[PDB]
Amino acid sequence: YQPTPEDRFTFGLWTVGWQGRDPFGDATRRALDPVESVQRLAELGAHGVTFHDDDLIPFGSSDSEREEHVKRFRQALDDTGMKVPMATTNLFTHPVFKDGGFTANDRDVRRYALRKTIRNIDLAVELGAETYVAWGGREGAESGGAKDVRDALDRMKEAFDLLGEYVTSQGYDIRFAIEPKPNEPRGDILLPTVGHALAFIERLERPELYGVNPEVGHEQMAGLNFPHGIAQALWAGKLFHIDLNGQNGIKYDQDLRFGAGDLRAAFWLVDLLESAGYSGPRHFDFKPPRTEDFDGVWASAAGCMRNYLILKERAAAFRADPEVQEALRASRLDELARPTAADGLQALLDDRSAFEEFDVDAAAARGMAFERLDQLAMDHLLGAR
Amino acid sequence: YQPTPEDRFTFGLWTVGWQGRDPFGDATRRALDPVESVQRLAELGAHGVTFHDDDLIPFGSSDSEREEHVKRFRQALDDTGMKVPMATTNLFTHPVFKDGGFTANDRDVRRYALRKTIRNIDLAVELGAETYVAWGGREGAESGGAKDVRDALDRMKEAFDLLGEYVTSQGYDIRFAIEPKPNEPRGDILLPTVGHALAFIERLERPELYGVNPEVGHEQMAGLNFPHGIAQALWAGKLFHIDLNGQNGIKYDQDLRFGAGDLRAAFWLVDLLESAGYSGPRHFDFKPPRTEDFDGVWASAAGCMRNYLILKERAAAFRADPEVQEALRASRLDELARPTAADGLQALLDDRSAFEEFDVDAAAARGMAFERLDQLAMDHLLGAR
Amino acid sequence: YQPTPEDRFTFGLWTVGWQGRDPFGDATRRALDPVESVQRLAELGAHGVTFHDDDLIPFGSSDSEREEHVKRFRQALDDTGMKVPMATTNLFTHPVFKDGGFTANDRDVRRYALRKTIRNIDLAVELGAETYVAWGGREGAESGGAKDVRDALDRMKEAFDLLGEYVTSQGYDIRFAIEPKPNEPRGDILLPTVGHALAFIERLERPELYGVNPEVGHEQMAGLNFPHGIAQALWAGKLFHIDLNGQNGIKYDQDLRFGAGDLRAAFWLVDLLESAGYSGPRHFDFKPPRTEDFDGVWASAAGCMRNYLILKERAAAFRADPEVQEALRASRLDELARPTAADGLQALLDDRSAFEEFDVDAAAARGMAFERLDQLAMDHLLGAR
Amino acid sequence: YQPTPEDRFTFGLWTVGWQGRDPFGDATRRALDPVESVQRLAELGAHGVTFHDDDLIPFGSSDSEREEHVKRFRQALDDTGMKVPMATTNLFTHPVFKDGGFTANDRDVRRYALRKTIRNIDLAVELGAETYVAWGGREGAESGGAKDVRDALDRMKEAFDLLGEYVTSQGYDIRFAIEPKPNEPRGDILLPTVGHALAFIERLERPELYGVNPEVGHEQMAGLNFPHGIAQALWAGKLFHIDLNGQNGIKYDQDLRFGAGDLRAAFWLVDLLESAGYSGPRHFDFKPPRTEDFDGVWASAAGCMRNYLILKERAAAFRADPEVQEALRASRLDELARPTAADGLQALLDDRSAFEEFDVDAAAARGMAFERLDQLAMDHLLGAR
Ligand SMILES: OC[C@@H](O)[C@H](O)[C@@H](O)CO
Ligand SMILES: OC[C@@H](O)[C@H](O)[C@@H](O)CO
Ligand SMILES: OC[C@@H](O)[C@H](O)[C@@H](O)CO
Ligand SMILES: OC[C@@H](O)[C@H](O)[C@@H](O)CO
Ligand SMILES: [Mn+2]
Ligand SMILES: [Mn+2]
Ligand SMILES: [Mn+2]
Ligand SMILES: [Mn+2]
Ligand SMILES: [Mn+2]
Ligand SMILES: [Mn+2]
Ligand SMILES: [Mn+2]
Numbered sequence A, B, C, D: 001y002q003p004t005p006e007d008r009f010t011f012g013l014w015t016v017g018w019q020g021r022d023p024f025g026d027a028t029r030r031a032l033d034p035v036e037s038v039q040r041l042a043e044l045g046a047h048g049v050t051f052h053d054d055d056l057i058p059f060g061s062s063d064s065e066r067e068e069h070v071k072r073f074r075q076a077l078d079d080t081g082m083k084v085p086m087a088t089t090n091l092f093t094h095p096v097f098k099d100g101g102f103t104a105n106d107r108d109v110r111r112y113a114l115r116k117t118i119r120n121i122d123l124a125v126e127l128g129a130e131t132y133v134a135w136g137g138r139e140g141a142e143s144g145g146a147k148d149v150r151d152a153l154d155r156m157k158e159a160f161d162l163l164g165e166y167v168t169s170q171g172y173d174i175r176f177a178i179e180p181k182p183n184e185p186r187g188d189i190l191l192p193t194v195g196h197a198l199a200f201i202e203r204l205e206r207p208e209l210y211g212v213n214p215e216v217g218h219e220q221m222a223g224l225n226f227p228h229g230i231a232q233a234l235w236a237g238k239l240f241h242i243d244l245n246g247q248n249g250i251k252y253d254q255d256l257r258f259g260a261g262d263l264r265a266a267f268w269l270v271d272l273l274e275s276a277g278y279s280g281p282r283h284f285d286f287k288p289p290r291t292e293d294f295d296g297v298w299a300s301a302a303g304c305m306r307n308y309l310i311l312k313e314r315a316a317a318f319r320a321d322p323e324v325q326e327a328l329r330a331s332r333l334d335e336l337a338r339p340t341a342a343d344g345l346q347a348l349l350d351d352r353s354a355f356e357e358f359d360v361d362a363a364a365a366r367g368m369a370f371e372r373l374d375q376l377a378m379d380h381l382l383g384a385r
């Protein structure tokens, strides 16, 4: 199960670079040089990296230092053949962002958050990224009077609409991907799920510039079915990017390596991305546990990739198995994919077999055969066929 | 705190009529006649009632019996001055709907679910309802291979699009309100939140025919902030109807009387509906606990109405209190409501005070004063001013 | 992966016999005769069955009918070689139990709940059961003033203490196993977790008569780590019985077949029961989904057994793998099992290497190597070694 | 609603002193001097403070600096009349504790964690504390093979048993209070609930030395009923101390001021502590939100105290209201407090009115009148009587 760069595996600088500072505990690992991580991730078989502005250029860097940091970084990309498919802005760490960036109550902060963003879209385009992520982690509230949500959506729509004006004015090929999260670090975060983000995009001036960046662990923090939300994103044409990780239920945001957490969810998510032909990056947004030294870092990043490739093999065996395709017909998946009434409304209304003469008892008696199907999918996952 | 019918309080027949059958236990109360409940709810000060088809006309009734049931019911509405603002279809009880109605894997079932719906839209319009709710409680799965979600959304969009064709062909003034729920009775239900429902409507052929019917307890079963979801629905123009009840956290769907459960949520929700000028029905979709006899039924329905009217008084005192309006300015709510950059993109880009000369430290030092605000809102709720 | 009766697999009559009545829906399957289920479960390789009183003898049966029902049942046990290791009381279905059995506010109800219990302990002993389960599913409240919890624990301790007097007075070899559940069908249920049940037993007059019956899905409905709770029960000597099933997170009690739900939890639970040498019944307390016909019933019961036996094989390969035992030493599991201070308190206090000269930096730098361990356990589960 | 020191309100140095560093964000407030906080908390009406070792004496302080820090602190206690009822150890911040203190896999770490503890019990006794808290925040795992839980409970019991030997050997009047938490910062924390902690104490050599320190927000992070767990702790005689705060459901540990979060829980908890006559400290273990400056700090600490005193007044009015005491009898709370069978087992067995002649229908028909009771308790809370 060996990754190659053709598998499209990517990692944030902040993921392998997490020093292991948590709400109760100091760092347990020294800071990695971005150079270092590029080199070590290319050896493991990754395809590229991603960054916040602030991961690559230290906050408050002179323009003399910015350019330095960028030079070095670009040399290591040249030396390794790594790409930069996606970039994003840190609008959550510095204290100025303690009430948000694009929805902060202070208007000055809000203009500062769009200037800091625009600066990093230029760099992102220079470095070749196709997708620009926006996680509004400070956009929200711990209290009901602190934030009027209708005014805060007006602000959010204004900031995204100015960024879409900027990008079309510059000529850039770059799209935006909004990342939902339901809570943490705010008490409640605005656009908390995939469905809220999808809905919001349909109100922006140019909706075809924006899609979603869902993360495994974030929709599971609301107790939702991650493969069902991604289906919906796929159904809308809006799955621009995806963050892969693991999460054990409804609790703080664990960011465990991909395959950890809900491992059957993980199986149905790979099944779906592979059968829909998702062709963007398989990005890992994870934190190696603070228990680990640098050995455990690179082990944990390697197991992200491994577990994807194992689950891809088992989902492919599942769909390719004749006894499975027979089960799928027994459970009427074929019929789910046929129109209910291609005949149209009038013919439906005149069809007596639809109502007046429909035998509800006979229909109700038929078994759906779902459990036999599900066990087939379990035997496939476990390799126990 | 006395309701009158001008408060727009409504109840489902199924709410006061719940016999108290639960997954572990038999009925504890006899069946109410719909007549009875209309009379008793008009005495308590309610404005109207709502129904499933199957609450009012027993499943499988001849057309001779349907008309009877409807006659009787209409007399009791005449005798009491009660209205029928909303109606809906039962597509969840009968065993034929064990895989869903509009997304069942069997195509025959799906045509039967639209015929059963259309029949009840006619009756709904006859009885004067303005809103037709659709809760797809059986639309979903307990297992990943049982349902392809992209085909199931195609089916759902086809069923809603044929119902919008039906209503515009008949000339009816009636809109649809889709009610989300994340789970129960299915393992996972499709369009599980407000945001998923909002997103989905924007893909139907005629989106201005459809809005949402959110329920308190349903978004809390995902751990989400119910007043934040309703703000978003208000912001989209799509809050057609609302279900009011109480829920203690993430667990089975409790349906406790309104004000029970999360009582500070309840306060910020009344604050919002009243300050936005929501003017639809305040509908109660609750179940009096099976511990209660008919005395406890009508006590529980009365406390729904009482608790709304108490929280309306305290939210109104809150917003009317000068010291509160002063706090709101101290916390910059005023600034949240101003555009970030009415000057436009170019002027933002040329403004040095937005970036080059923005003092981030000074901005970061300012306190948001949220806690003083929040305690004011607490003293108001508790009447301890 | 073929079960035999030596695997100690058991099922409740109520599990395969669930008609599929849920809070929103009628039965979807006819009632099974207990005879039938005994015969069909013996063919699949099960070791025995369990019952509520009310599953085997219809509520209100004359003593002429009781004996009949029991005769028939006993013949089918004779004909099949099935055992009855465990029995329990239904103190939740009938409306008289709407406030509880042993903690109902009415004292008359409470005496009735102990008489109904004692009657079924006699039958249980006749039929050879070793364990008598008590799930207090109606013991609790939806509201804070409805139940004083300290008086309700006095009542619960009084009922269990009289049942322990009864059993020691009759000479019976039978122990009690209390089953925790956090909620459903009550808003909150008393002794909601394993730890609450364990604590409570230590206050009964004869604590060595009582242990716990934990269920997978119940501790997961609180978001807790089921293998950690069973370790604690094992550590106390109190794991008398266990209920096996699957649950997807914090929501209504799904009762999916064992292996469904949290499949990595399932792996670490089999690892533990097998390495501790648990030798009681592996009981399945599950409901085949109401989507299924009788074919899907017996498929779902068979997959419970299958998935146990697959996970037993993979946990055994895991612990037997030298590279795994090497990893365990690398992560210091060996040291966890050594006493911290067998030298005693004084020697600890005089040991300078424990404090004055302990090098905290060097210790802090050591990696725990947990991620490499965890991936080994993942490759083992998936059979990808 | 003015606190005085006779109300027994206390605060941790770490609570008002939280700089607002979170998993995504830098500090937003400078460090407070312990002196400062003592002075400011005495002005607001608090009764005392509590500390970790490491809050009061910087980690790695020479013994020349320790004594200095302690001198200063003691002067400010003298100048203000503040007490120190409780102290505890920081065994979670420093990287050496990344796998735990008392259950770390490294035995060296474990001896170091008991030496660091013992040192601070001496200081605690010097400063007059009565209760010594132990929150094992690093005791647990993110992965199943990382920790054998039975060996880890052996270690935990060994560490607590040596601390009980230490304290009885020194002659100290000091008891231990174990604080449960279900998760965060570990994936799962050992003894995750009140009931697990209660159970564990009953296995220590001297159980009458140990009780529990429950925190509001921690049992709510498992979705449990905090007043029900404290009743159980009261029922066992083991409520040594309590941490008061607010939490909105199952998510990261918010630590909002007391009264925020679940405000009806807050009401029933004050009702219980006041009617049981709890006479330990009312300690606040909260964090003023990082949005706040020092003004918002002291506002947030003041609202903890205010909200306790408002809820005490409304619970007292509730229990003192004749119409309430009438409701309580209508709902049979009186009967809950009577023995079920003071007559004994034999008389129960011979009582025909308990079984043979018990009218189950009549009993089942009686209403429990809980909803009327609950609304009375709501009108009382809101002051709407
Ligand atoms: O929860 C943290 C979020 O996942 C971020 O890592 C975003 O993906 C990028 O800012
Ligand atoms: O959870 C059940 C749902 O709330 C229904 O009562 C809908 O509102 C109407 O079918
Ligand atoms: O949740 C229901 C409980 O699990 C019961 O099935 C008990 O095990 C036996 O009464
Ligand atoms: O969650 C953090 C815990 O509540 C601590 O503050 C303990 O109370 C003391 O170490
Ligand atoms: Mn995350
Ligand atoms: Mn992410
Ligand atoms: Mn509901
Ligand atoms: Mn509803
Ligand atoms: Mn269960
Ligand atoms: Mn069970
Ligand atoms: Mn806490």
Ligand SMILES: [Mn+2]
Pocket: D179, D215, D243, D285
């Ligand atoms: Mn605490």
